[PDB]
Amino acid sequence: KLPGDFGPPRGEPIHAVLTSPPLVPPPVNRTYPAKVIVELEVVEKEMQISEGVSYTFWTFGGTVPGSFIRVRQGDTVEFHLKNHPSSKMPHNIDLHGVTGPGGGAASSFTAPGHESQFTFKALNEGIYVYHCATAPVGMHIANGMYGLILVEPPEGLPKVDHEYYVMQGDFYTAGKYREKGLQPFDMEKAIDERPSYVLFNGAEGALTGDKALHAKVGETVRIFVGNGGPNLVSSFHVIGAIFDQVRYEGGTNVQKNVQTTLIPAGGAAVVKFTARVPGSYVLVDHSIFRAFNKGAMAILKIDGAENKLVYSGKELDSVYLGDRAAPNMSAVTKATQASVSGTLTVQDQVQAGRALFAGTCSVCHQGNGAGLPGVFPPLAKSDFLAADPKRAMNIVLHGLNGKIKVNGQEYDSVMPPMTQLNDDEVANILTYVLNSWDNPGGRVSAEDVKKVRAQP
Amino acid sequence: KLPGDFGPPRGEPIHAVLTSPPLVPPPVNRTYPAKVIVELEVVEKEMQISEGVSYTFWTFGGTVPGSFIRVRQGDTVEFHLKNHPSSKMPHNIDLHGVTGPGGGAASSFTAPGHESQFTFKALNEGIYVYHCATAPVGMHIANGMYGLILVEPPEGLPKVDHEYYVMQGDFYTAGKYREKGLQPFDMEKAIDERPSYVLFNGAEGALTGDKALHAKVGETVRIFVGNGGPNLVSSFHVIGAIFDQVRYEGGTNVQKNVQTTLIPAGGAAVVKFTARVPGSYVLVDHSIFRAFNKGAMAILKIDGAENKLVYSGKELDSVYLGDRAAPNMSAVTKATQASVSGTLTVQDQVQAGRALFAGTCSVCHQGNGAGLPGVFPPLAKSDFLAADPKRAMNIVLHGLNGKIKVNGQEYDSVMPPMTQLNDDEVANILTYVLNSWDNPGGRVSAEDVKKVRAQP
Amino acid sequence: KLPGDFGPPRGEPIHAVLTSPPLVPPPVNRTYPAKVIVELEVVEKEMQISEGVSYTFWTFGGTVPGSFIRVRQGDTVEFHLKNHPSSKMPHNIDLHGVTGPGGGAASSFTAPGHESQFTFKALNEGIYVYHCATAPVGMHIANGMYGLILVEPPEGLPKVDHEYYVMQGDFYTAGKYREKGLQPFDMEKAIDERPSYVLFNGAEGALTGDKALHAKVGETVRIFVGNGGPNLVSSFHVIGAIFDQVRYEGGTNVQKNVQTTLIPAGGAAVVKFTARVPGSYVLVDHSIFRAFNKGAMAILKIDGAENKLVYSGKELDSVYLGDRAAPNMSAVTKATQASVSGTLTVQDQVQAGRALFAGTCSVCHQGNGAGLPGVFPPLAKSDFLAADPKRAMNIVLHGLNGKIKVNGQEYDSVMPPMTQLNDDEVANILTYVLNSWDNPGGRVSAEDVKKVRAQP
Ligand code: HEC
Ligand code: HEC
Ligand code: HEC
Ligand SMILES: [Cu+2]
Ligand SMILES: [Cu+2]
Ligand SMILES: [Cu+2]
Ligand SMILES: [Cu+2]
Ligand SMILES: [Cu+2]
Ligand SMILES: [Cu+2]
Structure with missing residues (x-):
């Protein structure tokens, strides 16, 4: 036999x-x-x-x-x-x-x-x-x-209410993460196992926002999880939940009640999830910089009744998920197409900036730019911003520390540099800020940010 | 339910x-x-x-x-x-x-x-x-x-004699491993998953020497082992022993009788150890350059009766553990504080050098500098050292091979370069050597080593 | 006890x-x-x-x-x-x-x-x-x-028909992959965990070709598989088969019926394989660039009767295994020795080029250079090659795209660059091509390729 x-x-x-x-x-x-x-x-x-x-x-x-x-x-x-x-x-x-x-x-x-x-x-x-x-x-x-x-x-297989298909992969572009345009394959990065993106289902946001997977409280979900690599091993994890079962390939061994599990390059597993309370559950590679800096997050959104005896807290938001808490970031897609055509408007930048400001800036300066008095200075109607709006480019790229005054209040804190933001991202975020909350208006261009990035 | x-x-x-x-x-x-x-x-x-x-x-x-x-x-x-x-x-x-x-x-x-x-x-x-x-x-x-x-x-949980808490993490400094001073967080290294340190419990030596964990022959020890990452997966291993049990998170599966086990980024395990013979047992990440070049070692020291029928050998020493065989390296801490103040004495360097010489140099040249005749030349009262003590800087940084004579004996061997040693380490080690074993005395400064590192 | x-x-x-x-x-x-x-x-x-x-x-x-x-x-x-x-x-x-x-x-x-x-x-x-x-x-x-x-x-252990010993390791050379000569150990690559080779049993091809492991249909094979590291974790996989059993170290847990399994740095496993149909089964590290770009492949060759009801396809060839489908690549060894001596002949290059052309070029241009009309242009008696044979160096190093004509047929396709090929490999491959299929003859030297690699 x-x-x-x-x-x-x-x-x-x-x-x-x-x-x-x-x-x-x-x-x-x-x-x-x-x-x-x-x-x-x-x-x-x-x-x-x-x-x-x-x-x-x-x-x-x-x-x-x-x-x-x-x-x-x-x-x-x-x-x-x-x-x-x-x-x-x-x-x-x-x-x-x-x-x-x-x-x-x-x-x-x-x-x-x-x-x-x-x-x-x-x-x-x-x-x-x-x-x-x-x-x-x-x-x-x-x-x-x-x-x-x-x-x-x-x-x-035993019956479940939903079956889904999720596959991680590592990608190697000539350009850096979120650098716009048609990006060729980069052999040297691939040989060094230094991916520019790490993704579920072939793209950033493929399974976030309006593309999330769905189920309801009480339902069981099976996910067929693959790691196509080529090079990385995934510390595959579900935020805020547990897998009832994890089974690798055709193995006789089944692990139960774990939340984090290693998937080899070229490996695959079947996982099982039972929805217990509503909200968004995040599938990530818990080598954290992949999840939060290279795109390795997907969402299973659960609908139904809250159970306050089990969990009293609020739904996931942009503090943790950053710019992927929203339905999509299609304003970025649109603003990039418009730059390629030479038809980029101020409003195009504003809406792109708004998408990007979520998490990235709002965690400290707040969604409405108010900040928090004495701790995080305001961007809403900021006299400090208005005094030299072009210095805002340096602040984003290279950070800011030391004593400063803004809307007649003293601050002595540290804004870390955000040098990994591409020229267009910075331009668009700043353009958003300038056109919100009764700020002076105007615009910052990618060319402006490029000039400043290049200054010693 | x-x-x-x-x-x-x-x-x-x-x-x-x-x-x-x-x-x-x-x-x-x-x-x-x-x-x-x-x-x-x-x-x-x-x-x-x-x-x-x-x-x-x-x-x-x-x-x-x-x-x-x-x-x-x-x-x-x-x-x-x-x-x-x-x-x-x-x-x-x-x-x-x-x-x-x-x-x-x-x-x-x-x-x-x-x-x-x-x-x-x-x-x-x-x-x-x-x-x-x-x-x-x-x-x-x-x-x-x-x-x-x-x-x-x-x-x-079942009763055990001791419970301990150990958590690995990867750290990203602007400076290189053991470069002195206040080191900022380095985003580019973190994104590339190229850590400068890999540590248990937040520091080099946190669980070595006088900070080791303790137990006695016959006692059972439980360790709650976490990997906070952010990025690395630990090939978690105990040198010279075996885990009776390893259990990941809340999993139903328990593995028994293993010595090496993979811990995901964001993962955690409970391990169990039964002390059988006395000595130091080393917890490491067995991606070896982490353990031995970036700080990823911790010690469980066991007291009690030797059992020669089980193991006849000697306790761990500086051949394997290098400079962490000692109780601490506080001479380095002191010499660095003294340099920052501008009050660095020869004796400060000597005691720092002594701490650093263990393993790093003593493996070949011996603890007393005698070397081994014909094979490893002496540093104790070395005529070759005395003839041009400033050439010792080049020897440490860039190695030495070829035929040489020292205390009237021929040597034709290879001393590998040790270029990863920082300027102060080299200066201090050499200053130690110059002031020991009836060598000429004097001192080497970090500035001297810097000048030589910079020479083509 | x-x-x-x-x-x-x-x-x-x-x-x-x-x-x-x-x-x-x-x-x-x-x-x-x-x-x-x-x-x-x-x-x-x-x-x-x-x-x-x-x-x-x-x-x-x-x-x-x-x-x-x-x-x-x-x-x-x-x-x-x-x-x-x-x-x-x-x-x-x-x-x-x-x-x-x-x-x-x-x-x-x-x-x-x-x-x-x-x-x-x-x-x-x-x-x-x-x-x-x-x-x-x-x-x-x-x-x-x-x-x-x-x-x-x-x-x-239970009786099996064959027992074999295979151990992965990662190696750190000063030179790049397949750069010829005596390669020193490279500390900086090792500290970064950026190996130049990843090997089974100490060398490229150690277990491929005429050095493959052997067994026959129906026989059981046990492999003792080690990962000496120092740094890498292996996604250890068998192409075209399954392991009946995988057992880590002395663990009580045995996994059955898996094809891909993670081996820690410093870890070891016993695997069991039952031969079911004939052909070559490839052991790899499925972090794919290791297997296919750094040497991490070994072969278990099975002899016996085909079973067409189970698998109707053909034996592994150079499409997948590249230049390791052949018995050996000793022509490369010989041509390199001859260059070192200053006695390199055209025929030495030709035979080296032939070894290297398999997979690397033959996948598109075919084993006989015919190409495929309209899709992959011919190298056999190529007028385009003959028109400027020195441009072939640029084509290999930097690729070719756009419209071209060859043997009176139109092509508009993309030949990716192959910049990772060393100067001697390119010279030898091109020398092979020039001396085959009624092409003009002549030779390309490593010095020629070096000059072209250096051109902006
Ligand atoms: C995301 C891209 C943004 C943008 C556009 C800005 N910030 Fe911050 N920021 C923070 C703190 C503590 C300060 C004060 C620094 C100090 O005390 O020295 C700042 C300062 C600024 C300014 C200038 C002052 C003003 O109110 O106009 C500007 C223009 C600015 N920021 C824009 C704190 C943070 C964060 C905390 C972790 C984060 C994230 C950001 N800032 C992000 C952004
Ligand atoms: C650690 C930092 C040290 C220091 C301060 C020195 N060494 Fe070595 N060393 C080794 C061998 C084989 C030689 C002879 C080389 C040859 O044959 O060409 C040396 C040589 C030296 C010298 C010069 C000779 C002398 O005795 O004065 C000096 C000053 C020196 N070393 C200092 C071998 C080793 C090791 C073997 C693996 C290691 C480790 C070290 N040396 C480390 C150090
Ligand atoms: C491996 C080292 C080789 C060598 C020596 C060559 N190739 Fe290719 N090649 C491919 C395609 C599609 C083209 C046409 C490009 C276009 O349409 O613009 C080429 C072209 C060439 C040439 C020039 C034309 C000729 O026939 O003489 C030469 C000299 C050449 N190649 C040599 C496709 C591929 C592959 C597809 C994936 C691969 C692999 C290679 N080529 C590899 C090589
Ligand atoms: Cu595969
Ligand atoms: Cu925090
Ligand atoms: Cu987490
Ligand atoms: Cu050795
Ligand atoms: Cu070991
Ligand atoms: Cu393909």
């Missing part, structure tokens, strides 16, 4: 349902082995990795991660891979869980415009990463070529 | 006992749920991260890690957070193990001089990291804002 | 069998405790870390990893360590699994030309890393000073 030895395929061939993240195909719901036909197409395309930041992704099925594949242990899978004629590269696939050399790699080699096929029996139950296997393999994986395949046990 | 559903609180409210590392509050020792009141205050302050190296830590309760909190599963916790008026930043808290959004973050936002409160029921048993959750979150965590909370099971 | 309390030693002392990787000593096959005498000698020596790249390794027993030691739980081990007189450094050992301080470190300190000994009882069953423990510890470990010791349970 090999494992998964359930019989020869019965019935008619089934054309496999593939779904785009964050959704999952439905449970196969059958008691017999089948011949399952899978057709997956590779597409190379520019998408937004962040607001106003484009990247040329290489994809299985048009998304990052690629289409989710779901079969039953014991099935025979006929796997067709098409490489769209617009592709510039050849591609192939290695599916973890396949029994055989390269997990399909050699037989699935597929030049642009061609199709390949190989067949495999699904011997091993579990959740499994797949990815491209074409030299240079790391470049293909870094450009987005990974996804998950679930091989169900024969009796199926 | 939610978990931890034991009843409404009974009795009088309990004011929670918080302890400073490395100690732990005592077992709650009760059979009923209580309302537990926790008061924790944030304090920003300079402390010594290393000898003569100050750092502005942000702390829960005045220490890194912060005060340890201990409650019982099923308790209702009323959590008060005070931010001391000397603070420059606002702060808050996210406690892993809390059921609710942000783990307390939004309701615990607390400006300098203010107090906040929220209430939560402790549904989940286990050991859990807490940390600040204030944008920019990574900066707050990197500056020391983390600690542990234990939620006991209802029957309590 | 201590654990492993089986009695005082009986019979005659046994001189321990030590084996070189990838082999393992045989099972002790005994029912009583013994006094086991172990003699291990340290040797410092230059070996090839890669083709034409020498490195001064520090070794236990002449190999990296060091000799494998196998004893029975309950044995008393008398451990002799000799440091060969040619050594320049003192050395010692810390064996995980030893009960006692330093795991032997202090008593095993051994200068060049000397011998030391200590005795220990093997209380703890499992697989355990050993390594040198001599300041600076990280340098000694980085230079190759680690290996494995197995302490068998008293009844022995």
Whole structure:
């Protein structure tokens, strides 16, 4: 006996349902082995990795991660891979869980415009990463070529109310985090394992705000969690909750009641969550600078009745989530498009600045700019700002400490530098500030900030 | 039924006992749920991260890690957070193990001089990291804002003879490892996950030498081990022993009889150790350059009878532990204070040099400078040293190889460069050598070493 | 009762069998405790870390990893360590699994030309890393000073058909990956955890090609897998198969049916594999850039009958494995020796280029240079190449995009830059191309490529 030895395929061939993240195909719901036909197409395309930041992704099925594949242990899978004629590269696939050399790699080699096929029996139950296997393999994986395949046990997984698909990846851009424009792949950063972004589902904000996952108090949620890498290991964590179960790949071991769990590069797990009180629960890589400085956060939003005996506090806000507490940051997307066209208005900057000011500045200076008297000075109708509004550029980039006076009050505190903000972010935030709360108005341009960043 | 559903609180409210590392509050020792009141205050302050190296830590309760909190599963916790008026930043808290959004973050936002409160029921048993959750979150965590909370099971943990509290963290200074002075936080290093120090309990030597943890042969020791990060995953290991048990957070899985175990960023474990033979057992991050080049070592010292049938060897010494085999290195602290004052004496340098020479130089040249004839040349009454004592600076910084003669004996070997030693370390070591073992005397200054480091 | 309390030693002392990787000593096959005498000698020596790249390794027993030691739980081990007189450094050992301080470190300190000994009882069953423990510890470990010791349970491990020994390590060279010559240890890279190579068994290709491990369909294979570090954690994975069992050190927990598993720095595991279909199965660190850009791949080659009902595809090839699909790359070794001697022929370059062209260029331009019409242009009898063969250097280093014509066909595609190729690699590949497929002939030298790399 090999494992998964359930019989020869019965019935008619089934054309496999593939779904785009964050959704999952439905449970196969059958008691017999089948011949399952899978057709997956590779597409190379520019998408937004962040607001106003484009990247040329290489994809299985048009998304990052690629289409989710779901079969039953014991099935025979006929796997067709098409490489769209617009592709510039050849591609192939290695599916973890396949029994055989390269997990399909050699037989699935597929030049642009061609199709390949190989067949495999699904011997091993579990959740499994797949990815491209074409030299240079790391470049293909870094450009987005990974996804998950679930091989169900024969009796199926226990019923839950929702199933979702989330996959972490590390990305390597020539430019720095949130530097606008079309960003090429950066080999030197990738070789050093120094990613510029670390993301769930292929982009900043892919699962935050209006794109959050949903469920309700009392419901159970299953998440199929993959780490496509290429390089990082995820300290995968849920803020404000606990996983009832974590199960790696097809392992016999199941861990229960943990909140933080390590996912290897190329690894995958099924986690289970029971919603107990309402609010936003954040999935992160708890190597914290990834979560909070490189994009590695996703949200499961829960609706229903508060339970004050369990938790009396308020919903997550911009103090913790920063600029991702909002529904989106499309004002940034719009202001960047407008700069590229040469049609950038003051109001474009203002609305972009407003999006960016949340968390980043509001944590100390408040949402309304009032500050807190004696502790955090006001930006609302600030005489200090008005006295030399161009010095505000230096303050953002390089910080401010020492004694100062603002609206006739003394302050002796420290504003840390925020040098990681790109020129356009600083310009837009300051332009927002100048046009709010009865401040003088005017505008700061990215060119102005650039001049100041360059001053010793 | 939610978990931890034991009843409404009974009795009088309990004011929670918080302890400073490395100690732990005592077992709650009760059979009923209580309302537990926790008061924790944030304090920003300079402390010594290393000898003569100050750092502005942000702390829960005045220490890194912060005060340890201990409650019982099923308790209702009323959590008060005070931010001391000397603070420059606002702060808050996210406690892993809390059921609710942000783990307390939004309701615990607390400006300098203010107090906040929220209430939560402790549904989940286990050991859990807490940390600040204030944008920019990574900066707050990197500056020391983390600690542990234990939620006991209802029957309590099994009795052991000692309980200790150890928490790893990664730190990001503008200066290099052991560069003296007040070191600011370095954002670029933190974003790249390139820490300058990796520490247990907030400082080099915090748990070595005279600060070691203690127990005796036959006793059981429980250690609550946290990894506050922000970024690193610890290959947590005990040198010369084994953990009887390792249990992550509140997990149902318990691993037994391992010596090396991975702790995620933001993760925590309870480990158990049974002392079997006397000596020093070293807790490290076995990503070795952290343990031996960045400070990631702590010591559990065991007293009692030798058992020669089990182990015939000698106690740990400076060959392995380097300069941390000694009780402390306070001579370095003193010599650095003296340089800052402009009052540095030759004897100050000598005693600093002596502390630093252990391991670093003594492994080859021996504790008494004799060397080993033909293999390692002597520093004790060295004619080669005396012939040009200023060339000793180049030898330390850039190494020495090739044929040489010293006290009329031939040597053809390789002394590796030690360029990572800071100017003052080299000056002090050489000054020690010059004033020991009937060498010529004199002194080398940090300015001298600086001049030589700068020569091509 | 201590654990492993089986009695005082009986019979005659046994001189321990030590084996070189990838082999393992045989099972002790005994029912009583013994006094086991172990003699291990340290040797410092230059070996090839890669083709034409020498490195001064520090070794236990002449190999990296060091000799494998196998004893029975309950044995008393008398451990002799000799440091060969040619050594320049003192050395010692810390064996995980030893009960006692330093795991032997202090008593095993051994200068060049000397011998030391200590005795220990093997209380703890499992697989355990050993390594040198001599300041600076990280340098000694980085230079190759680690290996494995197995302490068998008293009844022995279950019988399998083959046992193998594989140990990952991270290496830090002054030069870049595949830069030729004698490469010194690089401390700054090591401190930053930025390795230039990541290897199984001490070298690129140590377990690929004609050095692969072997077994047959239906056979069971046990691999003792170590991670000597010094710094990296391995996302240890088998391509195209599954581990029936993974067991860390002496842990009671055994995980089954996984394909990817995290191995800590300093950790070790026993894995079990059952061969089900023929072909090459790749052991990698699935932090992918390590596997595919730094050398972290090894091969288990399986012989026997195909099973088309399980897997219909072809054997692994150069699309996935790149230049390690071949038996070896000794043409590179030879061409590098010839350059050092000043005797490099065109044919030397051609054969080196041929080795390197596999994967690296053949994935798009094909093994025969034909390309694919309209998609990948030909290198076979290429008029575009012939028109300006020196522009081929720029194409390799810096890529090519835009519209071009080659053998009267239009192309508008993208050839990515390959700037990580060293000067000699580029020269040799191009020299191969020029002398194949009726191309013009001639040669490109490393000096030519160097001149072009230096042009802005
Ligand atoms: C985010 C991008 C912003 C922007 C646009 C500003 N800040 Fe701050 N800030 C803080 C403190 C304590 C001070 C006083 C410094 C001192 O005592 O020396 C400041 C000062 C300023 C100014 C100048 C004064 C004014 O009120 O006009 C300006 C223009 C300014 N800030 C803009 C504190 C903080 C924070 C605390 C952690 C954070 C975050 C920010 N500031 C962020 C921003
Ligand atoms: C730590 C900071 C020190 C200091 C102050 C010195 N050493 Fe070494 N050393 C070693 C060897 C093999 C040599 C001979 C080199 C050769 O054969 O070419 C040396 C040489 C020196 C000298 C000059 C000779 C003398 O005896 O005066 C000096 C001044 C010196 N050392 C100081 C070997 C080692 C080590 C081996 C691994 C280590 C560690 C050190 N030395 C460290 C130091
Ligand atoms: C590995 C080292 C090699 C070598 C020696 C060459 N290539 Fe490529 N190449 C590719 C594509 C799409 C083009 C056309 C670019 C365009 O349309 O603008 C090229 C072009 C070349 C040339 C010039 C044209 C010719 O046929 O002579 C040469 C000399 C050349 N290549 C050599 C595609 C790829 C790959 C796709 C991913 C890879 C890998 C390589 N090339 C690698 C190499
Ligand atoms: Cu691809
Ligand atoms: Cu893979
Ligand atoms: Cu804080
Ligand atoms: Cu956290
Ligand atoms: Cu050594
Ligand atoms: Cu070790």
